[PDB]
C-alpha cells in the first residue's frame, strides 16, 4: 500500500470489503486539484494518436540512439568471430 | 562450556574498541603506491573514460528531469522507508509544489509529451529534501539503537502479524 | 494461510458433547488424500495401454508395488464405507434440516465420487470391468450418437480407456476443492450437536477434538491394515483378473459392492429407463426431505423408526444385487422399492392438525 | 524483603492542587490523600493486585496507534 | 553474566536495627531515625491460616473490635486519648501475619505503647460492639461490596490451596460471621496472641533501652507461650480453574493466573522478586514517560501493538510468599475480546524467562526493583512494616546492602535456571470474573508454559 | 454463527483475524455461571470410563431395543424370500 499518511482516511465510514485494494492506494492530495474531462462519446477518439505521432517517435529514437555505440561494438565482434571460425575451419581441414 | 568462553572473548574484544574513531574521521595519508596510481591512472582514466561517460549520463539525467518538469528529489520513491519518514515532516508549502510537479510529470510521461522549453530553465539538482532526510535518518537511528538492538521473541501469527517483526496486519502472504 | 489455519483448526470451537460419529468426516478427508497420493504414485509405473499386464508388472517387479496396488483398491472400499456411513449419520440426526447448504455441498462430492470409482474399475482392464461399462454405456443408448462420442469407437477399446483415465486423474482434484466449500459451510453454519438445541459447551479443536479424531482414525487403520495385508473381507471381485474376451460373457456382470444398490434398482425395474430414472430419484429425492415441513421442529431424537427401515432397505437391496436374477428375488426386490418410495414419502409429507 | 508499593510507580504529584503539607489533612488516612494506606475491609494482601491508577478503565481504548489513523476511523485489515 | 557490585557507601550509612528477646520470648526491634514522628506497633505471627474451618473469621472480627474499648478504658475515652496525643491507631489482619501499630509524635511513643498493650491484653469485647460490627462485616462480606481485585485475590487462594487452611479467607464465610461471639474471640486471643509470636517494633526518635524497659513492664502479664503449631506437609498446589462468567457486569474482564511460588526463606525468593519486577505493571491510563509501543518491558511493548489498540488495559505481576509455599503469577484487567491475547502474551513472557531473557531487561528490572524497595523505606511506617514483616518472615531484617549483594549475584542465567526448574512446563491455576468467552480451558493455557522453538 | 444477540460483543476491542469463528460462536450467558475444573495431570484419567461403563451400555441397549420389532419383520421377510427362491428353482428345474 501507499505511505501511512497517504492511506490515512478522513471519513469514518468503514472500507467496503470489495474496495480494500482501492483504499490502500489512496493519496492525501495537498493543496487541491481541479480535474476535468469529457466523455469519449463526445470526443475524437483517434486524433490524439496522430497528433502525438511525430513527437512520440522522435523522442523514442533519440533515446534508443544511446545504444548505437554498444550495438556497433557487438556487431564488430560478431563479424570477427564469424570470419575467425571460417578461417579456422579452412586451416584445420581444406588442403 | 565453550559458549561461556566465547561470550568472554566477545565481551573483552568489544570493551577494547570502545570509543574508537571511525575510519572516516582519521586523518589518512595515502600509501605511496596509491599516490603513484593516482598520478598515472586516475588522470588518464578521467580524461578518456570516466569523465566523458559520467558527463554523458549526468547531462541526460538533467534533460530527463527538465522534460518531466520535476526536481531530482521528486524522483525519490516513497517505498523507501527513509523517504517516507522524511515526507511525514515536510512543510505544506514544499509538499504542495512537490505533488503538483510530480503530477505534471506523470501526465506528460504517460501522454508521451515533454515540458515546453519556456518552462525548462531551472536547476533540477537543488536538494530541497536534504534537511528532512537528515532528520528522518536521525530519528530512525535512535529507534534502531534504543529499540531494536536484539532479535526479539514474540508470539507468532497472532493479531494479524507474523511475530517476526512487521507491525502492519495482513502484510505478508502467510498473514494474508 | 497460517492465520486461516489458526482460525479453522487451532481456535475453532466445537461442542464437547459430540460422539465418535462426528469423526467420520475427518477420516474421509485423510483417506481421500491417501487415495490421491497412491494413485499418482501408481501412475508412475502404470501403462494404460494394457492395465491387465500393467497391474501384474506393479505387483511383481516394482519394489513394494503390491502395497500401492492393494492400498489403492482397498482404500477405495474404505472411502465408500466412510462416506456411506457419514450419510447414514446425517440422516439419523437429521443434519440437513438447518444445514442444507452443507448437505448440498456433500451431495456434489457424492456425485463426483460415483463417477471416479466406476472409471477407476475400468482402468483395471479385466473381464468384469469391460463388460460392466459396456452395459452401463448402453443405458444412454437412447440419446442418439452419444455412446459413440463417449466411447470413441463402436465398442469399448483402449481409446475409451485413454479418455476416462483423464477424468479419473483430474476429477479427484476437483473433489478436494469441493471439500473446501464443504468445510467452509461447516465452519460458518455451526455443526449440529447430539442434542437438538444450541448450548455453550464448545472447546477448541486442536487440543481436544483432533486428539479424539486421531484415536478414531488409528482404530480404523488397525482394521484397514489387516484387510490390506490379509484380505479378511472379500471387497474385490475375482473375475477382474480374467483377461478381457469380447466374445465370452462373464458368469455375472456386477459392479463393486458400493454400486450394488443402483445395480439392483436397474435389474429389478422392467423398463431400462425406468431403472435409470429410479437411480436418479435415489440420489436426488434425499436432497429435499425437509423442504415441505411447516412445524417449528427438526424431527430429531425421536425413535427414528423410519430411518432404521431405510438403512435396512439399502442393505437388503445390495444383497439382491449379488444374487443372480432369480425371478423370486426380483419380485421381493420390487416390493422393497415400493417400500422405499413410501418411507421417503413419510419424510417428505407435512402433517395436518387434529 | 516485602514490596510495599505497586510495580507501576505513580509518577504524579502527591499533594493536591492548592493543598500543602500543612493543610492536606493527614496523608496516611485522609480520603483525598493519594498515598493513604488502603483499607483492610476484607483483609490484607489484595494491594498486590490492586490497580492504584485513579482514572477508571476505558475498555478497548487505543494505545497502539503509531499515527496511522485518525480518531474515530476503523482500520480495515490493518490499513 | 556478572557486571560488578552495585553496593555503595550510602547503603552502609543506615542506623542499625537492634533486636532483643525479652525473657518472656517477645522480640523487641527498634531503628533510630532523625524524625519528629514515630511508629510503634505489635507485629504478630497470627492470621486466618491458623484458624479452623468453623472459626474462620474470628481473627478479622477481633481486629475490628480490639480498639472499641478496653477493660480500663472506654471507646470514647480511648479515642479521645489517642487524639489528644496527636496519634492514630492502625491495624490489619492477613492469612499469616497481623499488626497493631500506632503512628504518633515523639512524645507519644511510650504513651502509645501503654494504649496498645491494654488493647491487646485486656480487650473489652462488648456485646453491643460485636453486634454492630457483625452488620458491618456482613455487608463487606457481600461480593457486591467487594472490588474485583479483592475477589480474585481471595479466589486464587481458594483454587490453589483446596487442601489446606491457606485457602480460607480472612473475613470468613457468612455462616461463621453470623455465629461469632465473644467466647470465640477470647479463645483466639488466648491461643494466638502470645509473647513468643509478637514483635514490638519502634521506629523513629527512639532509644532501644527505654523501649525495652517499657515493653517488659507493659507486657509482663502476657501469656509466655502457646503449644507449638501442628506440623503439616507442604501446602499442595492444585492446578484448578475457578471462573465466574458474568456477561452482565460490563466489558472489562479480570483474570488472574498463578504458578506455584517459593516460601519466604527459599534461596530463590529474591530471584522470584526480580522475575516479578521483570513482568512489571502497565496501565493504559497511566503509561508514564515511555509509551507502551516503545517500552523496554517486552510484555508491555508486544501487548501495546496487538490489533493497533493494545491487549492490556491493566496488568501486574504478583509474588506472594508464605512460610512454606508461595504464589507467582500475573493479574489482568482487559477488554472481553482481548482476553485471549492478554493471557497469551503474559504467559509467553513468563515462558520466555526460561529461554530468551536479555541482560538488558534484567538490569533495568534490578534498578526498578531497588527503586521500589528503597522508596518504601522512606517513612517510619514503611520502615516499621519492613522490620516487623522481615523478622516474622526471616527471624531477622535483611539490610539494604545485603539485599543488593544477593541481587548482584542474580543474572539472566540464574533467572533462566530458576524458571526452567520451577516455571517451565509447570502447572497453573486460572481464576477470573467477568465476560470470559475468550478465556480458554486450563489445559490450553498450561501448554503455553513451554515453546516449540528453541 | 449464533443468534445476533448471542454474538453481540460487550467489548470494543477488535476481533482478532484468527479468532473470527471463535467469536461467531459466542453466547450471552444469562444469570452467570461458576465453572470449575482440575488439570488432567492431577486426576485419574481412565476411571470415569469404568465408572460410567454400566450405565452407558444400559441406556444404549434400551434405546436400541426400539428397533427389535422392525428387525424381526425384516428377518422374517429375508427367510421367506430365501425359501421362496429355493422352492422356485427346484420347481422350474429339478425333475
Ligand atoms: C454508413 C454505412 C455504414 C455501413 C456499415 C459499416 C460498418 C462499419 C464499417 C467501418 C469501416 C471503416 C470506417 C473508417 C472510419 C472510422 C471508423 C471508426 O473507427 O470511427 C471511430 C474513430 C474515428 O476517429 P475520430 O477521431 O473519432 O473522428 C472524429 C471526427 O469524426 C472527425 O475528426 P477529424 O476528421 O476532424 O480528425 C480527427 C481524426 C479523425 O480520424 C479518423 O476519423 C480516422 C480513423 C481511422 C480510419 O483524424 C486523424 O486521426 C487522422 C488519421 C489519419 C490516419 C492515416 C493512417 C495512414 O476511428 C478509430 O477509432 C479508428 C481506430 C483505428 C485502429 C487501427 C488499427 C486496426 C488494426 C486491425 C486491422 C484494421
Ligand atoms: C576442543 C574440543 C574439546 C572437547 C571436550 C570434550 C569434553 O570433555 O566434553 C565436555 C564438553 C563440554 O561439556 P559442558 O561443559 O557440559 O557443556 C555442554 C555443551 O555441550 C557445551 O557446548 P556449547 O554449549 O558450548 O555449544 C557449542 C557446541 C556446538 O557444537 C556444534 O555446533 C557441533 C558442530 C556442528 C555440527 C557438525 C556436523 C557436521 C556434519 C557434516 C556432514 C557432511 C556431509 C557431506 O560445541 C561443541 O559441541 C564442542 C565445541 C568444541 C570446540 C569449541 C567450539 O561436552 C561436549 O563437547 C559435548 C558435545 C555434544 C558412540 C556410540 C553411540 C551409540 C552406539 C549404539 C550402537 C552400538
Ligand atoms: C513429494 C513431495 C512432498 C512434499 C511434502 C510437503 C510437506 C509440507 C508440510 C507443511 C506443513 C505446514 C504446517 C503448518 C501448521 C500451522 C499451524 C498453525 O496454524 O499454527 C498457528 C500457530 C500460532 O502460534 P501460537 O499461537 O504460538 O500457536 C498456537 C497453536 O496452539 C500452536 O500449535 P499447537 O502447539 O496447538 O500444536 C502443535 C502441533 C501439535 O500436533 C499434535 O500434537 C498432533 C499431531 C498429529 C499428526 C498427524 C497424525 C495423523 C495420523 C494418521 C494415521 C494414518 C492415516 C491413514 O499441531 C499443529 O501444529 C497443528 C496440526 C494440525 C494437523 C491437522 C491435520 C492432521 C492430519 O503457529 C504459527 O503460526 C507459527 C508456526 C507456523 C508453522 C511453521
Ligand atoms: C490364547 C491367545 C489369547 C489372546 C487374548 C487377547 C485378548 C486381547 C484383549 C484386548 C482388550 C482391550 C480392551 C480395551 C479396554 C479399554 C477401552 C478404552 O480405553 O476405550 C477408550 C478409547 C477411547 O476413549 P474415549 O473416547 O474417552 O471413550 C470411548 C467411548 O466414549 C467409550 O465408550 P465405549 O465403551 O463404547 O468404547 C468402546 C469402543 C467401541 O467402539 C466400537 O465398537 C466401534 C465400532 C462400532 C460398531 C460396533 C458393532 C458391534 C458388533 C458386535 C457383534 C457381537 C457379536 C457377539 C457374539 C457372541 C457369541 C457368543 O470405542 C472405541 O474404541 C471408539 C472407536 C472410535 C472409532 C471411530 C470411527 C467411528 C465410526 C462410526 C461408528 C461405526 C459405524 C459402523 C459400524 C456400525 C455397526 C452397526 O477407546 C479406544 O480407542 C479403544 C479401542 C479398543 C476397543 C476394545 C477392543 C477389544 C478387543 C478384544 C480382543 C479380544 C481377543 C481375544 C483373542 C482370543 C484368542 C484365543
Ligand atoms: C529427510 C528427512 C525427513 C524428515 C522428516 C520429518 C520432518 C519434521 C519437520 C518438523 C517441523 C516442525 C515445525 C516447524 C519448525 C518449528 C516452528 C516453530 O517453532 O514454530 C513455533 C510455533 C509455536 O510454538 P512456540 O515455540 O511459539 O511456543 C508457543 C507455545 N505453544 C508451544 C503452546 C504453541 O510452532 C507451532 O505452531 C507448531
Ligand atoms: C476420489 C479418489 C479416487 C478413487 C475413489 C479412485 C478409485 C480407484 C479405483 C476403484 C480403482 C480400481 C482399483 C482396482 O483396479 O481394483 C482405481 C484405479 C486407478 N486409479 Fe484411482 N481413485 C481415486 C483417485 C485417483 C487419483 C487422484 C489418481 C492419480 C492420477 C488415481 C490413479 C489410479 C490409477 C493409475 C489406477 C489404475 C491402477 C489400479 O488399477 O490400481 N486415482 N482408482
Ligand atoms: C467426499 C465426501 C465428504 C467429506 C470429505 C465430508 C467431510 C465432512 C466433514 C469434515 C464434516 C465435519 C465433521 C463432521 O461433523 O463429521 C462434515 C459434515 C457434514 N457433511 Fe460431509 N463429507 C462428505 C460427504 C458428505 C455427503 C455426501 C453429504 C450429504 C449426503 C454430507 C453432508 C454433511 C453434513 C450435513 C454435515 C454436517 C453434519 C453436522 O451437522 O455436523 N457430507 N462432512
Ligand atoms: C443412497 O446411498 C447409499 C447409502 O447412503 C444412504 C447407503 O447407506 C448405502 C448402504 C451402505 C452399506 C455399507 C450397506 C448405499 C450403498 C447407498 O447407495
Ligand atoms: C457395472 O454396473 C454398474 C451399475 O449397474 C447397473 C450401476 O448401477 C452403477 C451405479 C450408477 C449410478 C448412476 C449411480 C455403476 C457405477 C456400475 O458400475
Phi and psi torsions of C267, nearest 5°: -95, -10
Distance from CA of F48 to the nearest CA of B (A): 36
Please tell me what DSSP assigns to residue E202: E
Q: Are C300 and C94 in contact (CB under 8 A)?
A: yes
Which residue's alpha carbon is nearest to atom 28 within ligand 6?
C39
The rounded distance, in Å, linking the Cα atoms of C220 and C214 is 10
Closest CA to C264 of C252, C275, C274: C275
Q: Which residue has the cell 522508596?
A: E375
Q: Which residues of E touch B150 (CB under 8 A)?
A: 358, 360
Q: E199, E42 in Cβ contact below 8 A?
A: yes
Q: Which residues pair with E103 in a beta bridge?
A: E39, E88
By CB atoms closer than 10 A (0-12, 13-18, 19+), residue D73 is middle
> Which of these, E134, E157, E447, E77, lies nearest to E327 by C-alpha position?
E157
- From atom 16 of ligand 6, which residue's Cα is the shortest distance away? C73
Residue C292: C-alpha distances to residues A51, A89, C345, E55 (Å) = 70, 91, 11, 68
Relative to beta strand E27-32, strand E198-204 is parallel
C-alpha cell at B90: 515536510
CA of residue C323 to ligand 1 center, whole Å: 78
Determine the distance separating the centroid of ligand 7 and the alpha carbon of C86, expressed in angstroms: 7
**For residue C79, how many C-alpha atoms fall within 13 Å in the half-sphere facing its CB?**
24
Q: Do the Cβ atoms of E372 and D5 come within 8 Å? A: yes
The residue whose CB lies within 8 Å of the most ligand 5 atoms, and thus the one to mutate among E349, E353, E440, E452, is E452
Residue among E340, E441, E447 whose CB faces C203 most closely: E441
| DSSP result, E376-411 | HTSSHHHHHHHHHHHHHHHSSPPPHHHHHHHHHH--
Q: Do E305 and B147 touch (CB under 8 A)?
A: no
Look at D68 and A8 and tell me if their CB atoms are within 8 Å: yes
Closest residue in chain E to residue C208, using alpha carbons only: E444
Which residue's entry shows cell 492400498?
C71
Q: What is the DSSP letter of E51?
A: S
Under 8 Å between Cβ of C133 and C254: no
Q: How far apart are CA F24 and CA F9, in angstroms?
A: 10
Q: Which residues contact B117 (CB under 8 A, 6 or more apart)?
A: none
Q: What share of chain C is helix, strand, coil (3-state, %, to 5)?
A: 70, 0, 30
- State phi, psi for C187 to the nearest 5 degrees: -75, -35
Using an 8 Å Cβ cutoff, are E248 and F32 in contact? Answer: yes
Q: In 3D, which of E14, E15, E16, E20 has the Cα closest to residue E214?
A: E20
Between the two ends of chain F, the Cα-to-Cα distance in Å is 71
Measured in angstroms, the CA of D60 and the nearest CA of chain F are apart by 5
Residue at grid coordinates 463526445: A42
For B149, nearest residue in chain E (alpha carbons): E360
The C-alpha atoms of residue B75 and residue E402 are separated, in whole angstroms, by 64
- Name the residue with the closest Cα to ligand 4, atom 73: C21
Interchain contact, E309 vs D5, CB within 8 Å: no
Give the count of Cβ contacts less than 8 A between chain A and D. 27
The answer to whether C168 and C42 have CB atoms below 8 angstroms apart is no
Q: Are strands E27-32 and E17-21 parallel, antiparallel or unpaired?
A: antiparallel
Angle at C15 between CA C12 and CA C16, to 5 degrees: 110
Q: Which residues pair with E31 in a beta bridge?
A: E17, E203
Distance between CA atoms of residues C250 and C243, nearest Å:
11
Neighbours of chain C (3+ CB pairs under 8 A): B, E, F
> B159 in helix, strand or coil?
coil
**Closest ligand 4 atom number to CA of residue C217:** 68
**Which of C203, C209, C210 to probe by mutation at the E interface, max E CB count within 10 Å?**
C203
Give the three cell numbers for residue E359: 541482560
d(CA E198, CA B96): 78
Residue (of E7, E272, C164, C309) closest to F74 by Cα position:
C309
Q: What is the DSSP string of F32-52?
A: -EEEEEE-GGGS-SSHHHHHT
Q: How many CB atoms lie within 10 A of CB E394?
A: 13
The experimental resolution of this structure, in angstroms, equals 2.5
Q: Which residue's alpha carbon is nearest to atom 2 within ligand 8?
A: C84
Contact status, residue E336 vs residue F13, Cβ threshold 8 Å: yes
Q: How far apart are CA E370 and CA E11, in angstroms?
A: 12
Mutate to test the pocket of ligand 6, among C55, C132, C168, C241 (most ligand atoms within 8 A of CB): C168
Nearest Cβ partner for D42 among E146, E337, E371:
E146
Q: Which atom of ligand 7 is nearest to the CA of C110?
A: 27
- Angle subtended by helix axes E182-192 and E58-65, to nearest 10: 100
**Ligand 5, pocket-test mutation among B155, B156, B174, most atoms within 8 A of CB:** B156
**Probe site for chain E from D5, D8, D62 (most E CB atoms < 10 A):** D8
Paired residues of E319 in beta bridges:
E328
Please state, in angstroms and rounded to a whole number, the distance separating the CA atoms of residues E367 and E377.
16
CA angle E252–E258–E262, rounded 5-degree value: 145
What is the three-class DSSP state of E283?
A: strand
Of all ligands present, the nearest one to the C-alpha of E350 is 5
Cβ-Cβ contacts under 8 Å, B160 against chain F: 16-18
Angle between helices C305-322 and F68-92 (to 10 degrees): 20
Q: What angle, 0 to 180 degrees and rounded to 10, lies between the N-to-C axes of helices C305-322 and C260-268?
A: 80
Distance CA E237, CA F42 (A): 10
Q: Residue E69 and residue E53: Cα distance in Å, rounded?
A: 28
Which residues does residue E200 pair with via DSSP β-bridges, in sequence order? E28, E42
> Max alpha carbon distance in chain F (Å)?
90
CA nearest E268: which of E128, E54, E423? E423
* Helix (H) / strand (E) containing E314: strand E314-321
The minimum CA-CA distance between C27 and chain B, rounded to whole Å, is: 27
The CA distance from C185 to C285, in Å, is 22
For residues C58-94, one letter each, b for 16 or more C-beta atoms within 10 angstroms of the residue's C-beta and e for the rest, the string is beeebeebebbbbbbbbbbbbbbbbbbebbeebbbbb
As for chain B, the residues directly before each break of C–N over 2.5 Å are none
Who contacts A76 (Cβ-Cβ below 8 Å, separation ≥6)? none
Are C342 and C119 spatial neighbours (Cβ–Cβ below 8 Å)? no
Which residue does chain C place closest to B173, by CA atoms?
A: C1
Helix axes C260-268, C327-348, angle to 10 degrees: 110
Rounded-to-integer distance, Cα C133 and Cα C167, Å: 15
User: If residue C327 lies in a helix (H) or strand (E), which one and from where to where?
Assistant: helix C327-348
Give the list of residues 6+ apart from residue C333 with CB closer than 8 angstroms, or none: C264, C268, C317, C320
CA C270 to chain centre: 26
At E363, give phi and psi (nearest 5°): -65, -40
Q: Which residue of D has its CA nearest to E293?
A: D64
Pairing of strands E281-283, E98-105: unpaired
Where helices occur in A24-67 by DSSP H, the ranges are: 47-51, 53-64
CA angle E439/B165/E310 to nearest 5° reads 40
In the block, residue with C-alpha cell 485457602: E167
Q: What residues does E320 pair with on adjacent strands?
A: E327
3-class DSSP assignment, residue E101: strand
Catalytic positions of E: 63
d(CA E190, CA E198): 13
Rounded distance from Cα F4 to ligand 6 centre (Å):
46
Which residues on chain C are in Cβ contact (under 8 Å) with E443? 207
The verdict on a CB contact (< 8 Å) between D79 and A14 is: no
The protein residue whose alpha carbon is closest to atom 3 in ligand 7 is C106
Please name which of C282, D49, B137 lies closest in space to residue E332, comparing C-alpha atoms: D49
Rounded-to-10 torsion of CA E242, E244, E245, E251: -120
* Centre of ligand 5 from the C-alpha of residue E452, in Å: 5
Distance of alpha carbon E248 from alpha carbon E144, whole angstroms = 13
F54 touches chain E (CB under 8 A): no
Q: Does E247 touch chain C (CB under 8 A)?
A: no
- Distance between first and last Cα of chain A: 71
Which of C87, C90, C96 has most ligand 8 atoms within 8 Å of its beta carbon, as the pocket-test mutant? C87
Q: Could you tell me which chains touch chain B, where touching means 3 or more CB pairs under 8 A?
A: A, C, D, E, F
- CB within 8 Å: B174 and C3: yes
Distances (CA, A) of C36 to C44, C75, C205, C222: 13, 10, 26, 21
Amino acid at each position: 500500500p501507499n505511505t501511512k499518511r497517504d492511506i490515512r482516511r478522513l471519513g469514518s465510514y468503514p472500507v467496503p470489503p470489495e474496495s480494500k485494494n482501492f483504499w490502500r492506494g489512496r493519496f492525501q492530495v495537498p493543496g487541491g486539484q481541479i480535474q476535468q474531462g469529457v466523455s469519449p462519446m463526445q470526443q475524437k477518439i483517434f486524433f490524439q494518436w496522430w497528433w502525438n505521432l511525430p513527437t512520440r517517435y522522435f523522442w523514442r529514437f533519440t533515446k534508443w540512439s544511446d545504444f548505437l555505440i554498444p550495438s556497433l561494438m557487438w556487431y564488430t565482434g560478431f563479424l570477427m568471430c564469424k570470419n575467425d571460425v571460417e578461417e579456422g575451419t579452412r586451416s584445420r581441414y581444406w588442403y | 562450556s565453550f559458549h561461556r568462553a566465547f561470550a568472554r572473548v566477545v565481551c573483552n574484544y568489544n570493551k577494547s574498541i570502545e570509543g574508537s574513531v571511525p575510519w572516516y574521521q582519521v586523518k589518512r595519508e595515502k600509501s605511496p603506491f596509491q599516490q603513484v596510481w593516482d598520478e598515472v591512472f586516475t588522470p588518464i582514466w578521467f580524461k578518456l573514460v570516466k569523465g566523458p561517460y559520467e558527463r554523458w549520463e549526468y547531462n541526460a539525467l538533467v534533460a530527463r528531469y527538465r522534460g518531466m518538469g520535476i526536481m531530482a528529489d521528486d524522483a525519490m520513491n516513497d517505498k523507501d522507508m527513509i523517504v517516507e519518514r522524511a515526507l511525514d515532516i515536510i512543510p505544506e508549502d514544499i509538499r504542495i509544489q512537490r505533488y503538483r510537479r510530480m503530477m505534471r510529470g506523470a501526465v506528460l510521461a504517460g501522454r508521451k509529451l515533454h515540458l515546453p522549453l519556456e518552462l525548462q530553465n531551472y536547476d533540477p539538482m537543488v536538494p530541497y529534501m536534504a534537511p528532512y532526510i537528515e532528520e528522518a535518518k536521525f530519528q530512525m537511528q535512535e529507534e534502531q539503537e534504543l529499540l531494536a538492538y536484539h532479535p526479539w521473541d514474540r508470539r507468532l501469527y497472532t493479531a494479524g502479524v507474523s511475530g517476526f517483526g512487521e507491525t502492519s496486519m495482513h502484510s505478508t502472504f502467510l498473514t494474508m | 494461510f497460517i492465520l486461516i489455519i489458526k482460525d479453522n483448526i487451532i481456535l475453532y470451537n466445537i461442542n464437547d458433547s459430540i460422539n465418535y460419529l462426528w469423526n467420520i468426516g475427518y477420516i474421509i478427508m485423510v483417506v481421500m488424500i491417501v487415495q490421491v497420493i497412491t494413485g499418482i504414485i501408481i501412475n508412475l509405473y502404470m501403462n494404460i495401454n494394457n492395465g491387465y499386464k500393467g497391474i501384474i508388472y506393479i505387483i511383481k517387479e516394482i519394489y513394494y508395488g503390491y502395497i500401492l496396488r492393494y492400498i489403492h483398491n482397498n482404500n477405495s472400499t474404505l472411502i465408500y464405507v466412510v462416506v456411506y456411513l457419514h450419510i447414514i449419520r446425517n440422516l439419523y440426526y437429521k443434519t440437513y434440516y438447518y444445514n442444507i447448504l452443507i448437505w448440498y455441498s456433500g451431495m456434489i462430492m457424492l456425485y463426483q465420487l460415483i463417477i471416479i470409482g466406476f472409471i477407476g474399475y475400468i482402468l483395471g482392464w479385466g473381464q468384469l470391468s469391460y463388460w460392466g461399462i459396456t452395459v452401463i454405456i448402453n443405458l444412454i443408448s437412447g440419446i442418439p450418437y452419444l455412446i459413440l462420442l463417449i466411447s470413441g469407437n463402436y465398442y469399448i477399446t483402449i481409446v475409451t480407456i485413454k479418455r476416462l483415465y483423464i477424468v479419473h486423474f483430474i476429477l479427484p482434484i476437483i473433489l478436494i476443492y469441493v471439500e473446501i466449500i464443504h468445510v467452509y459451510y461447516i465452519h460458518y453454519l455451526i455443526n449440529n450437536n447430539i442434542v437438538e438445541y444450541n448450548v455453550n459447551n464448545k472447546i477448541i479443536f486442536n487440543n481436544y477434538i483432533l486428539v479424539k479424531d486421531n484415536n478414531g482414525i488409528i482404530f480404523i487403520l488397525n482394521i484397514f491394515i489387516l484387510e490390506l495385508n490379509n484380505n479378511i473381507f472379500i471387497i474385490a471381485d475375482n473375475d477382474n483378473l480374467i483377461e478381457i474376451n469380447i466374445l465370452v460373457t462373464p458368469i455375472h456382470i456386477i459392479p463393486e459392492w458400493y454400486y450394488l444398490y443402483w445395480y439392483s434398482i436397474l435389474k429389478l425395474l422392467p423398463n431400462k429407463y425406468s431403472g435409470l430414472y429410479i437411480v436418479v430419484n435415489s440420489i436426488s429425492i434425499i436432497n429435499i426431505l425437509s423442504e415441505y415441513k411447516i412445524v417449528i421442529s427438526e424431527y430429531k431424537n425421536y425413535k427414528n423408526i423410519i430411518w432404521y427401515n431405510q438403512i435396512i432397505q439399502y442393505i437388503s437391496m445390495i444383497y439382491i444385487g449379488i444374487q443372480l436374477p432369480i425371478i423370486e428375488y426380483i419380485n421381493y426386490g420390487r416390493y422393497i422399492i415400493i417400500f422405499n418410495i413410501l418411507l421417503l414419502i413419510m419424510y417428505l409429507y407435512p402433517k395436518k392438525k387434529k | 524483603p516485602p514490596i510495599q508499593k505497586p510495580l507501576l510507580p505513580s509518577g504524579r504529584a502527591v499533594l493536591k492542587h492548592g493543598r500543602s503539607m500543612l493543610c492536606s489533612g493527614n496523608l496516611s488516612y485522609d480520603v483525598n490523600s493519594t498515598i493513604k494506606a488502603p483499607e483492610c475491609k476484607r483483609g490484607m494482601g489484595f494491594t498486590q493486585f490492586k490497580r492504584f491508577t485513579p482514572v477508571p478503565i476505558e475498555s478497548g481504548v487505543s494505545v497502539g496507534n503509531r499515527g496511522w489513523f485518525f480518531p474515530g476511523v476503523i482500520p480495515y485489515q490493518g490499513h | 553474566y556478572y557486571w560488578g557490585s552495585t553496593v555503595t557507601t550510602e547503603m552502609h550509612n543506615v542506623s542499625p536495627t537492634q533486636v532483643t528477646r525479652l525473657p518472656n520470648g517477645m522480640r523487641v526491634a527498634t531503628q533510630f531515625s532523625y524524625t519528629d514522628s514515630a511508629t510503634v506497633g505489635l507485629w504478630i505471627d497470627a492470621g486466618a491460616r491458623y484458624e479452623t474451618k468453623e472459626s474462620n473469621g474470628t481473627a478479622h472480627f477481633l481486629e475490628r473490635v480490639l480498639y472499641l474499648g478496653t477493660k480500663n478504658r472506654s471507646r470514647d475515652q480511648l479515642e479521645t486519648e489517642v487524639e489528644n496525643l496527636g496519634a492514630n491507631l492502625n491495624s490489619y489482619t492477613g492469612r499469616e501475619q497481623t499488626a497493631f501499630y500506632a503512628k504518633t509524635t515523639k512524645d507519644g511513643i511510650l504513651p502509645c505503647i501503654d494504649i496498645l498493650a491494654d488493647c491487646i491484653l485486656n480487650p473489652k469485647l462488648d456485646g453491643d460492639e460485636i453486634e454492630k460490627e457483625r452488620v458491618r462485616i456482613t455487608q463487606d462480606l457481600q461480593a457486591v461490596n467487594q472490588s474485583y481485585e479483592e475477589l480474585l485475590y481471595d479466589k486464587v487462594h481458594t483454587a490453589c490451596y483446596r487442601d489446606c487452611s491457606l485457602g480460607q479467607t480472612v473475613i470468613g464465610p457468612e455462616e461463621n460471621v453470623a455465629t461469632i461471639k465473644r467466647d470465640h474471640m477470647v479463645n483466639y486471643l488466648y491461643n494466638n496472641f502470645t509473647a513468643d509470636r509478637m514483635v514490638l517494633v519502634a521506629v523513629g526518635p527512639v532509644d532501644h533501652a527505654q523501649i525495652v524497659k517499657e515493653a517488659e513492664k507493659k507486657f509482663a502479664n502476657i501469656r509466655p507461650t502457646a503449644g507449638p503449631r501442628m506440623l503439616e506437609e507442604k501446602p499442595y498446589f492444585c492446578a484448578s480453574e475457578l471462573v465466574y462468567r458474568n456477561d452482565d457486569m460490563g466489558p472489562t474482564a479480570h483474570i488472574a493466573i498463578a504458578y506455584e511460588g517459593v516460601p519466604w526463606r527459599s534461596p530463590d525468593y529474591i530471584t522470584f522478586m526480580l522475575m516479578n519486577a521483570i513482568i512489571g505493571s502497565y496501565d493504559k491510563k497511566n503509561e508514564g514517560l515511555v509509551p507502551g509501543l516503545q517500552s523496554a518491558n517486552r510484555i508491555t511493548q508486544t501487548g501495546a501493538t496487538r490489533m493497533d489498540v493494545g491487549c492490556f488495559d491493566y496488568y501486574t505481576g504478583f509474588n506472594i510468599a508464605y512460610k512454606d509455599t508461595g504464589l507467582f503469577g500475573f493479574y489482568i484487567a482487559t477488554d472481553e475480546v482481548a482476553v485471549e491475547h492478554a493471557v497469551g502474551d503474559l504467559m509467553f513472557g513468563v515462558t520466555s524467562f526460561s529461554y530468551s531473557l536479555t541482560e538488558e531487561e534484567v538490569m533495568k528490572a534490578k534498578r526498578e526493583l531497588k527503586t521500589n524497595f528503597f522508596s518504601g523505606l522512606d517513612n517510619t511506617t514503611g520502615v516499621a512494616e519492613d522490620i516487623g514483616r522481615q523478622i516474622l518472615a526471616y527471624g531477622r531484617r535483611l539490610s539494604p546492602a545485603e539485599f543488593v549483594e544477593r541481587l548482584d549475584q542474580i543474572d539472566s542465567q540464574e533467572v533462566q535456571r530458576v524458571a526452567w526448574n520451577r516455571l517451565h512446563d509447570a502447572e497453573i491455576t486460572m481464576t477470573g470474573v467477568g465476560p470470559l468467552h475468550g478465556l480458554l480451558q486450563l489445559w490450553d493455557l498450561r501448554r503455553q508454559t513451554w515453546w516449540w522453538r528453541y
